[PDB]
Design an enzyme around this catalytic site. Structure first.
Site, PDB file in Angstrom:
ATOM      1  CG  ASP A 221      44.686 -43.428   6.993  1.00 40.30           C
ATOM      2  OD1 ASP A 221      45.453 -44.360   6.680  1.00 40.30           O
ATOM      3  OD2 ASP A 221      44.563 -42.376   6.331  1.00 40.30           O
TER       4      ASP A 221
HETATM    5  O1  LIG Z   1      49.244 -47.421   3.243  1.00 40.69           O
HETATM    6  C1  LIG Z   1      48.074 -47.543   4.048  1.00 40.69           C
HETATM    7  C2  LIG Z   1      47.460 -46.178   4.317  1.00 40.69           C
HETATM    8  N1  LIG Z   1      48.487 -45.241   4.790  1.00 40.69           N
HETATM    9  C3  LIG Z   1      47.958 -43.913   5.134  1.00 40.69           C
HETATM   10  C4  LIG Z   1      47.182 -43.295   3.980  1.00 40.69           C
HETATM   11  O2  LIG Z   1      46.594 -42.076   4.427  1.00 40.69           O
HETATM   12  C5  LIG Z   1      46.123 -44.249   3.445  1.00 40.69           C
HETATM   13  O3  LIG Z   1      45.494 -43.683   2.294  1.00 40.69           O
HETATM   14  C6  LIG Z   1      46.761 -45.579   3.095  1.00 40.69           C
HETATM   15  O4  LIG Z   1      45.770 -46.498   2.650  1.00 40.69           O
END
Ligand SMILES: OC[C@H]1NC[C@H](O)[C@@H](O)[C@@H]1O
Ligand SMILES: OC[C@H]1NC[C@H](O)[C@@H](O)[C@@H]1O
Ligand SMILES: [Mg+2]
Ligand SMILES: [Mg+2]
Ligand SMILES: [Mg+2]
Ligand SMILES: [Mg+2]
Ligand SMILES: [Mg+2]
Ligand SMILES: [Mg+2]
Lengths: 781, 781, 215
Positions: free
Chosen positions: A259
């Protein structure tokens, strides 16, 4: 403090079965690369540095552009000329594998048309441990089976369309509070580490891991490890999570990305099973790590071949087109730096990828409507003498459909939650719009819409005159980086927003034919009004996307009989669901400690354990017709005995204790193939029953199969199967499914395998988790 | 693109004169240090990683703690139980060297009591190129002499109190737009580099550099290099700026720190003259650079000794106490990580350092009130039958005095701008409060306060009954990281905020005795109302700090005759001032290019050059008495002819071309001592005039001495000296000052020195830049 | 101070009800003004006033740091020809106005020395907070006219010992006081019939008769 035991080495691809073709091509490709080019694949380019939410480094030497990774689970985020699909929770409420698949295909087609390589979805984490979890709506259901099946269908859809899907977030990210220290500090909390979700081996296996196993087995190309820790080890460097559970037991052949800014032990993360660092320091350290022998050559080689395997598996080689949009601007052109000076380049081509996808969005909208109450309120005709429409949730976002960035507001009708799990509405049909259109195309009676929740005088005035009053209320949530009205992602309560309750009460006091429509991300407490006799019907419609108003009126006015079932429980109180969110640090300045003490007992399992009656149970929903269940039969299939996996891997190819060991490794007892030991999916029983439509209109029924595993610590019932079936008046069907070995098993930590326990099991077929019409023993053998 | 020539090596300390004691002690301390310990002094500990806004690394081996660096120029930021002093612009309006000094002393005392080592102020950059520059109020005046003089007095005050002062920001940070790429991106601009202030050598010397020269000569311990580039080199790695101008020509002996996260070429910055990196990689790279020879040992030694010299110069060895507050929380206690587990430690001792500082705050408040108009309106008596108070600027911040973080709002009376240049009010006395107190302690007439700018009906109602109407209006601005009502630090216009002009127009239409009080960060456009005959008086009161209301009424009710002079020009239009802010990128994705094409012609110089008549000219202010000017006399002093500096430096001691050269270096012609060649400060002429108080009350006059340098490209007049003098009715004084060689010189780029040109020079003494009552030739010699 | 005709609003400190029973303030000394005057004339400690009932974050912030927290709440009413916030002269409930209760709860949760000052035209329901241990004192000040702030601080800061006695009962519920207002006609289009069936049993007589214990 909870501790996560180590598991090394990080498993390398075997490329057996349906991954063989993709493995072959990945090897052929990676074989040609330098160390630097290999590391490029694993390295994010940095936050907002290129066009997509994330991009890998390129390999220009072979004309291989960096991969484009794009949100969201319900559409193409940021891009123009795209569709806004219903949220995952709506998909869950359809209980419809086919619709889940078609949504995946449509989404996949849109991503493909924009040149996206990886769609950052769908979501099975959060699963839905808490009713007030901020991001549950992005997923499907607290139930692991309903979530798992629809997760799998969605993945197949996206990937059949030629885009890599990404199962997220792995794992235990069941709330937004304290997910990231920096974020927590912004909200005035003094912590320096993300929350630790403390989950035992059995709970993981029987609850949170189950849908991710389904995702692996569906052939998902990538995983995203989560921000939180599990047993005080960050997911993205948690060897038990990635190496043992994911890549050994579940035998995942694809690649794991972090993430965005998810904390991991740098180069150590690669040894613990991380394959790709997003969004982007890592590159040069990994290079050095390989050169000095801290990271084996076989590990980076496996990272690269996993990424390329996913690429070839979905056919990116065939379907890839240039990225024709920009995440960070709607401008047609922009500047880019070159070796000397700057280039003025085209950045947005405004490629319209929407096709006919409005159709499936309207359909899923209608299919996700759940009729909770109907005392002669529905359906409507459109020939009503006076229709009143009430609530801001009926009206427009006065700032435009896309007027709030990342949908971070509750302006007008709620059709999408907030955060990364978003996309831009090409347009948005409001309930106000659809209902007026319905009336003015039919009986042309009176219609007024009071879309200010403060205008209680007017609501009184209009409701007093109405043949029918249609009331709209909502409740919103989303990702933790956005705070709306004191909801830091997670919901601070289970109340309707913007005084929705007072709207309902005002209208119901003045109209004895009041219909309530709830657009909510999850359950709210409805105890004070649901049983009001002036409320003649109640529907939940969730987050329906761009066709909200149209999909709703299709149901309200009887073109479509509602056949959705609530994918979560509607309880009397917040306490009904169990313990609150952890919203106060409990480990000083260190990682907050979040003990999953309830085990598998979330949502309906909890209500069942404590003998508490929900207002509306999991799997409950009404219809404009009636259905009858009869004549259950259980057929033992006399499956072969379960054999624990044995043998060893091949040695790690080239193209912390154990971390650098590339020798043949023993296969885990419950491992052996993607999704676990194949014997787990042997069919043990065939269960069938007759469903009949005994009413006067066509409608859909969702028959549900529940199993009692029969142990002292087992839930009374767990969902194991379901379908959605259309039946015309007087039409019968034979509903037949099979129970797998996994379906009747429990996880045994001691033996590290799924076991069918000696306790008698019972199978139930019914119309909800509480309306168990039919039952039979599962005879042992 | 404008280019910044290189200048190496980075000059090492001389430690002559006032710096001799400090240098000797600094040498003795640094001689005992390891490389790592030396590097620790140059390294910030990271953003929010300790107690102060910035902290250096420590040397525990010698029981030497990290330095504590704390905002702001007008008090101790973040800490509790501190005072909120008037802003720098108010100090400028006093034209009072003594008050500037006493404010510095009081601030230094408060920093000292909290354990602060370095106060991050005062400000001579921005100087005030644009009237709508967001942070001008933090400094003093667009005039370099007024700013330089009061800057020097402030520094002396702080450092005499035993705290290190920090001249910021060096240099050319004249607006907030595009100061930092990350910030610009947050506002939707696509740039990857900070704006470049493109300033020619002559303009630098005669305008922007001038007050910084004063700061050096005043003995300031530290400098802060700015976020922006100068001639396409970031200030913090601009060798011309730091090595040549600051450390050679101005011969600065103290240390240079970066602005927080100000971009620089890492190790390269050290060679270009940077001494300290804030808020803190650098440590590791610097250590490596020394070991491998890319950074000479004499450079890191010089960095360490400069820091320690500043420490010893102000007597931190004597005055240092433990840091007894926390910047990041008001909580008494907080958890901290230990080797084993955590500790719960006292983080805030709530040490009350306010002493009697409320007195000097009230005094400077009163002294900074500028009377711009008075046709029989002021003073008031307190025996008026009915006093009307009007405007939100009269009233309270409804969220509490400190209810807006970093003062990032315009709630109630404006007593402080927003951003880092702030401190928490211990309390705030509003005009509403102070005026009601005045009336109720005296005549006990009627008094009503309408403090909603929208309540125009009520204002009509009250004003038409009033003996006097006192109207309050404001205009706010601040640092670029805060956006209030579309003001991205910089002001989007020169209008009064919150419909202030309509308040004035409404009240003046109903009351023929209307007094207007302006609390503004700088000039606003007053053309439409200043000359309204019903407006009987106008004052500017600026940003008065915690005693605003009391300092005001002391003036309004005649206990203090107003004696302030406006430190900037009040023009008819925005265009009067010159060209707009650069608010649109003009170099694609690269550094925006901000050409200072107007040269030295900012504020009153511009008005004079283009023959634009100000509404209120620079240096203008009225009194409750009158003053008469007479009998100018010029005495030539027959100073020694100017000798360009020559000779060599010592070789660099231990304790890009020329970057590692530690051999003796040639002294620059205009260098040779802190503040420049000492011959520049030779007194060339003595000038006197007689000021007489010809009115009926005691009052202060600010006589001003202007010079015409006489060339075609010289301003008509430039301020060169001033004083504030109290005179009783009928009293006379002889005001005698001297002009230095610098005062009558121009910068010559060819010879790199100050020259007295052959153009005839004239001296003027008067009461404003336009009211030049007396003049005489300066006869050459 | 006189910005609302016949005092027909609840803006700022309540020192007078609305309708014909009014007069114009020559001036109005607020609690904010008097308390700041008290501090700045004596110990000159820190003082801050958060006077927006919706600014709950700031209230927590300030209450957290306070030696003492002085909370101001009100409830208004008046003659029938003026309707303020659905109060047609008569009060539509006995709640504190403008979320006063939430102000009290927020401050009390962050400060264990909270003083509550009530400016009310009559009783309000205080059952949910009067017994809060963080509330160390409670006063009713009513509608004090032009000197409100000064008269108050005279008592708060000990120049005058409080000696007033409540001239009405403070009950647990509205039902404690007996039957509601007659607020819907009960005689068709003719004169509504308002039967005084309780007789002499109003206020404390009623409480005593039915053995209801006042707060
Ligand atoms: O925006 C990218 C990414 N940011 C953090 C989020 O938790 C995730 O779901 C997302 O894909
Ligand atoms: O807050 C620290 C630092 N931030 C950045 C500002 O430009 C500077 O003036 C201030 O000292
Ligand atoms: Mg770009
Ligand atoms: Mg399609
Ligand atoms: Mg394998
Ligand atoms: Mg800290
Ligand atoms: Mg003092
Ligand atoms: Mg020197």
């Amino acid at each position: 403090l909870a501790y996560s035991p180590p598991f090394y080495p990080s498993p390398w691809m075997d490329g057996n079965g349906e991954w063989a073709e993709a493995y072959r091509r990945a090897v052929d490709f990676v074989s040609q690369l330098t160390l630097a080019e290999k590391v490029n694949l694993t390295t994010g380019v940095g936050w907002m540095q290129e066009k997509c939410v994330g991009e890998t480094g390129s390999i220009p030497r072979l004309g291989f552009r960096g991969l484009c990774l794009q949100d969201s689970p319900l559409g193409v985020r940021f891009a123009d000329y795209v569709s806004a699909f219903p949220a995952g929770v709506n998909v869950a409420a359809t209980w419809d594998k086919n619709l889940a698949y078609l949504r995946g295909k449509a989404m996949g087609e849109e991503h493909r048309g924009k040149g996206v390589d990886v769609q950052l979805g769908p979501v099975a984490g959060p699963l839905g441990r808490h009713p007030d979890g901020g991001r549950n709506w992005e997923g499907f259901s607290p139930d692991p089976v309903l979530t798992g099946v629809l997760m799998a269908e969605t993945i197949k859809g996206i990937q059949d369309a030629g885009v890599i899907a990404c199962a997220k977030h792995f794992i235990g990210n069941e709330m937004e509070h304290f997910r990231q220290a920096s974020e927590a500090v912004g909200y005035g909390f003094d912590i320096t580490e993300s929350v630790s979700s403390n989950i035992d081996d059995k709970t993981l296996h029987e609850l949170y891991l189950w849908p991710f196993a389904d995702a692996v087995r569906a052939g998902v190309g990538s995983f995203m490890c989560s921000y939180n820790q599990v047993n005080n080890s960050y997911s993205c460097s948690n060897s038990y999570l990635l190496n043992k559970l994911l890549k050994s037991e579940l035998d995942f052949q694809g690649f794991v990305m972090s993430d965005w800014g998810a904390h991991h032990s740098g180069v150590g993360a690669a040894l613990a099973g991380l394959d790709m660092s997003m969004p982007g320091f890592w590159g040069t350290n990994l290079t050095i790590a390989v050169l000095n022998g801290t990271v084996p050559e076989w590990r980076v080689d496996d990272m690269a071949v996993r990424i390329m395997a996913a690429f070839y598996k979905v056919g990116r080689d065939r379907y890839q087109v240039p990225v024709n949009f920009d995440s960070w601007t709607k401008d047609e052109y922009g500047y880019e730096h070159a070796l000397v000076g700057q280039n003025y380049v085209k950045v947005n081509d405004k490629v319209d990828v929407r096709a006919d996808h409005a159709d499936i969005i309207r359909q899923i909208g209608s299919a996700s409507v759940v009729l909770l109450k109907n005392d002669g309120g529905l359906p409507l005709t459109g020939y009503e003498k006076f229709t009143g429409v009430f609530g801001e949730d009926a009206g427009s976002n006065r700032w435009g459909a896309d007027g709030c960035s990342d949908r971070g507001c509750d302006n007008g009708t709620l059709a999408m939650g907030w955060g990364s799990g978003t996309a831009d509405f090409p347009y948005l049909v409001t309930p106000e719009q659809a209902i007026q259109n319905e009336i003015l195309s039919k009986g042309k009676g009176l219609v007024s819409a009071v879309t200010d929740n403060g205008a209680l005088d007017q609501m009184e005035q209009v409701a007093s005159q109405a043949s029918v009053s249609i009331v709209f209320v909502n409740a919103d949530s989303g990702e933790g980086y956005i705070n709306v009205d004191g909801n830091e992602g997670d919901r601070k309560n289970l109340t309707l927003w913007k005084g929705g309750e007072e709207v309902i009460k005002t209208v119901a006091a003045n109209c004895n034919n009041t219909i309530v429509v709830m657009h909510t991300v999850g359950p709210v407490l409805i105890d004070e009004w649901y049983d009001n006799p002036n409320v003649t019907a109640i529907v939940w419609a969730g987050l329906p996307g761009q066709e909200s108003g149209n999909s709703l009126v299709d149901v309200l006015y009887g073109r479509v009989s509602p056949g959705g079932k609530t994918p979560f429980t509607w309880g009397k109180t917040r306490e009904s669901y169990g313990a609150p969110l952890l919203t106060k640090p409990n480990n000083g300045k260190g990682a907050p400690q979040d003990d999953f003490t309830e085990g598998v007992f979330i949502d309906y399992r909890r209500f069942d354990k404590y003998n508490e009656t929900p207002i509306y149970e999991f799997g409950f929903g009404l219809s404009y017709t009636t259905f009858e269940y009869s004549d259950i039969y259980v057929q033992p299939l006399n499956a072969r005995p379960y054999t624990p996996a044995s043998g060893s891997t091949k040695a790690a190819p080239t193209f912390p204790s154990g971390a650098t060991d590339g020798s043949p490794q023993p296969i885990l007892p419950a491992g052996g193939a993607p999704g676990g030991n194949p014997g787990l999916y042997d069919e043990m029983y065939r269960v069938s029953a007759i469903i009949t439509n005994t009413g006067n209109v066509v409608g859909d029924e969702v028959p549900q199969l529940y199993v009692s595993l029969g142990g002292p610590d087992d839930p009374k019932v767990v969902l194991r199967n379901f379908d959605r079936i259309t039946l015309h008046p007087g039409q019968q069907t034979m509903w037949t499914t099979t129970l797998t070995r996994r379906d009747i098993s429990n996880w045994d930590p001691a033996s590290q395998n799924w076991v069918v326990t000696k306790y008698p099991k019972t199978v139930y077929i019914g119309s909800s988790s509480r309306k168990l019409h039919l039952q039979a023993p599962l005879p042992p053998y």
